[PDB]
Enzyme design. Structure first.
Site, PDB file in Angstrom:
ATOM      1  CB  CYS A   1     -51.030  23.683  57.679  1.00 58.74           C
ATOM      2  SG  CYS A   1     -51.885  24.126  56.135  1.00 58.74           S
TER       3      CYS A   1
HETATM    4  C1  LIG Z   1     -50.967  23.298  54.856  1.00 57.46           C
HETATM    5  N1  LIG Z   1     -51.005  21.993  54.649  1.00 57.46           N
HETATM    6  C2  LIG Z   1     -50.192  21.773  53.624  1.00 57.46           C
HETATM    7  C3  LIG Z   1     -49.935  20.401  53.015  1.00 57.46           C
HETATM    8  N2  LIG Z   1     -49.627  22.905  53.224  1.00 57.46           N
HETATM    9  C4  LIG Z   1     -48.654  23.033  52.112  1.00 57.46           C
HETATM   10  C5  LIG Z   1     -47.211  22.895  52.595  1.00 57.46           C
HETATM   11  O1  LIG Z   1     -46.892  23.924  53.526  1.00 57.46           O
HETATM   12  C6  LIG Z   1     -50.114  23.860  54.009  1.00 57.46           C
HETATM   13  N3  LIG Z   1     -49.759  25.129  53.885  1.00 57.46           N
END
Ligand code: A1IAQ
Ligand code: NA
Length: 165
Positions: free
Chosen positions: A59
């Site tokens: 993430c």
């Molecule tokens: C962290 N968690 C989620 C769902 N995202 C978006 C997809 O990368 C992040 N950056």
């Protein structure tokens, strides 16, 4: 609902939150050691992503990009929550070249974990947050909720983007 980590299985602690329920506004701590309310005043789509650990997380790597794309969308906010202290969160984030990302710590009250039902129970990850994503409307009602079954995996990307259409 059960979450898995290698040979460990977790019962999720806190109150279960369903699509259509009003998510409670909770106190978290930001990078400036300022107490903030999770729910942004007026924003129509509020993405709330929770991680057991920011350190070397998938993430964190895609946070800079996703934050840009959401920022340009009308009335979409992006918040990342972990039990990590803000100092570590600030240095982890800063090291990956992620500026102005709303990374928030649940360390002080464990209010997010307890109220969104993602506080991991007995086991090696006890007291950390289950990998999860919520989309809340301006009213704090849950538009979308996903808790990853395997704590090491990422939430459904397709399903999350479709909700922001
Ligand atoms: C962290 N968690 C989620 C769902 N995202 C978006 C997809 O990368 C992040 N950056
Ligand atoms: Na998802």
């Amino acid at each position: 609902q059960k979450v898995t980590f290698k040979e460990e299985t977790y019962q999720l602690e806190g109150k279960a939150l369903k699509v259509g329920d009003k998510a409670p506004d909770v106190k978290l701590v930001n990078g400036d050691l300022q107490e903030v309310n999770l729910l942004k005043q007026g924003v129509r789509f509020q993405v709330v992503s929770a991680l057991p650990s920011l350190t070397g997380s998938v993430c964190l790597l895609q946070a800079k990009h996703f934050n840009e794309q959401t920022g340009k969308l009308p009335s979409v906010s992006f918040s990342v929550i972990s039990m990590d202290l803000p100092f570590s969160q600030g240095q982890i984030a800063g090291a990956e070249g992620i500026k102005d990302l709303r990374i928030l710590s649940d360390f002080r009250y464990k209010a997010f974990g307890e109220n969104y039902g993602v506080l991991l129970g007995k086991g090696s990850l006890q007291g950390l947050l289950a990998r999860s994503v919520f989309v809340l409307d301006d009213k704090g009602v849950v538009i979308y909720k996903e808790i990853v079954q395997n704590i090491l995996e990422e939430p459904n990307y397709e399903a999350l983007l479709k909700v922001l259409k």
